[PDB]
Design a protein around this ligand. Structure first.
Ligand code: E8N
Ligand code: E8N
Ligand code: ZN
Ligand code: ZN
Ligand code: ZN
Ligand code: ZN
Lengths: 330, 330
């Protein structure tokens, strides 16, 4: 019962209020090292992230789970530096997202399992920092390689107790296939969060997952392009459903009896090179609260709509602790 | 008139016998750092590369051009270590090959030009090592992003005098479109090598490029799967034309008056993670000479077929020096 962070193991009690799907920087493997000026400078990115995490900490956040994989350009040295300076725990991820390079896409399920286990059990690169979560992705029907990634993630989870969290095209109901593959490997749904699930309003899809034991990641609450006029790229990324609409899915699942299975987050970033240039500026204009958006805006909104403080504390503290603490069956 | 290597500038005289298309390791950005055990260990890869380069040096090679880009997982610290230990100059590359990540594929022609110029004029990552060549790629008709890469490579070459070298699907005559795009930006064909050109027997394609001034990269001479029975992956990568057939294209271009435009190489590697597992073992069984294959087997073969020593010295020493030495018009 300890959770690996970029600064070492922490007890479940130390995690506190936890955002379960966030990014310091959404990039690509090697990109921050090769082209730091894309972000102004590495120091500028560090400074921005520390300011943002300090603001989140002032609003009550104690831990974020950075679900950046290898192919999101996860730099655990950057995460450790930012975590130290902001006094916010950061859980790092292994796994693979939607942009694996050839050297990953040509691998077998066994090889991929070895790589994920390396990052969980030994360390990331030469840093000794161990991942506390496994991140995977589909965008519609899984590609053949994505099927291997899902299976390898299940195998790594079954060996270590570390949970799996997923990226979906929620409107395509990807979670159903993801669940099918995970269960074919014997993985407990208690160890899996189906993420980007606030991208859909289909309650039959969401409750079908929750009914069989999955955690539901409502992780992009502030993502919306409403009020951005004539920005095609921002609308394609963020959608045109309001943050209130996304947040009300939290209340819906509470009202259906799934309060213990909800995980809430911002899916925010402090740099973002894997999309159009200046998307970060657009996103910061939409949501200047950044990662503090959940505690500063969503929690009071749900309280106004009748959700209790106790229930929201369970969702933001108890559920992330139960999810992250390593086990085969949570 | 100095050429950048991973150990600093060298004079044109110091380059000597030069292989113009080689790789220490064919991988993906960040992969060697994240999963060195894929290659046994980093130290094992270093040892293998040093042994191979020492064998090449004993056969007469003095310089190789490592045309690994960012997305081939070029590790210039690895190149410098291997170059020091083997006493063989290594020229590093910028540019982009066929596996760019999202953080590259979303960039503009201007942004890409900035990145290529960074690696030529300032340094690669934080190493201060500067690229001496720009590598680009198409596989058939250029994708929209590949058109931007080709244009940015031309712009970087026009600003610095550093040459461009290309990957083609030679049987699809990619060099014709590559030339068209390069020339639309004003780039001199004297600054461009159209590579993998030994993958085709079409002399009308090859002479059409050479006639307008391009250098012709006959750079995969030992690549052949003849005599490998029932290895689909090796045959798809290496082809079923013999090394003698590839080598005779050198003689053909000499006989057509293009001796000053021929560049010859092995396109060898000491590690190879961007293809099927154990491809390196298959390749080493096909060609145990590795990068020494050109001087030990191809040069004597061409001499037996009537090519003079003087002409082969011009192709292996003079042409690479004229190609690499920075200039707008060579
Ligand atoms: C938390 C306490 C339970 C209610 C009131 C009903 C599920 C929701 C808020
Ligand atoms: C090098 C000298 C010229 C010949 C004999 C004819 C082009 C080829 C070998
Ligand atoms: Zn995602
Ligand atoms: Zn995310
Ligand atoms: Zn190539
Ligand atoms: Zn090559």
């Amino acid at each position: 019962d300890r959770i690996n962070t970029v600064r070492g193991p922490i007890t479940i009690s130390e995690a506190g209020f936890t955002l379960t799907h966030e990014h310091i920087c959404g990039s690509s493997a090697g990109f921050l090292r090769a082209w730091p000026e894309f972000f102004g400078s590495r120091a500028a990115l560090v400074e921005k992230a520390v300011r943002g995490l300090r603001r989140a900490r002032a609003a009550g956040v104690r831990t974020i789970v950075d679900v950046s994989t290898f192919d999101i350009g996860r730099d655990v040295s950057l995460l450790a530096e930012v975590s130290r300076a902001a006094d916010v725990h950061i859980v790092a991820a292994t796994g693979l997202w939607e942009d694996p390079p050839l050297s990953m896409r040509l691998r077998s399920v066994e090889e991929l399992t070895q790589f994920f286990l390396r990052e969980i059990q030994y360390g990331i690169e030469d840093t000794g920092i161990r991942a506390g979560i496994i991140k995977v992705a589909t965008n519609g029907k899984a590609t053949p390689f994505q099927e291997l990634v899902l299976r390898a993630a299940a195998r790594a989870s079954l060996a270590t107790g570390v949970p799996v969290t997923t990226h979906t095209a929620a409107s395509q109901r990807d979670g159903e296939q993801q669940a099918a593959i995970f269960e074919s490997e014997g993985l407990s749904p208690s160890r899996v969060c189906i993420g980007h699930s606030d991208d859909t309003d289909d309650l039959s899809y969401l409750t079908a997952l929750a009914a069989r034991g999955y955690l539901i990641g409502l992780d992009g609450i502030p993502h919306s392009a409403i009020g951005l006029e004539d920005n095609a790229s921002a609308s394609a990324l963020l959608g045109n459903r309001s943050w209130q609409t996304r947040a009300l899915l939290i209340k819906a699942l509470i009202d259906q009896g799934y309060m213990k299975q909800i995980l809430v987050s911002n899916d925010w970033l402090f740099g973002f090179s894997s999309y159009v240039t200046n998307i970060m500026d657009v996103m910061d204009s939409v949501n200047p609260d950044g990662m503090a958006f959940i505690p500063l805006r969503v929690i009071p909104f749900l309280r106004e709509k009748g959700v209790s403080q106790e229930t929201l504390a369970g969702i933001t503290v108890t559920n992330p602790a139960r999810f992250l603490s390593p086990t085969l069956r949570a």
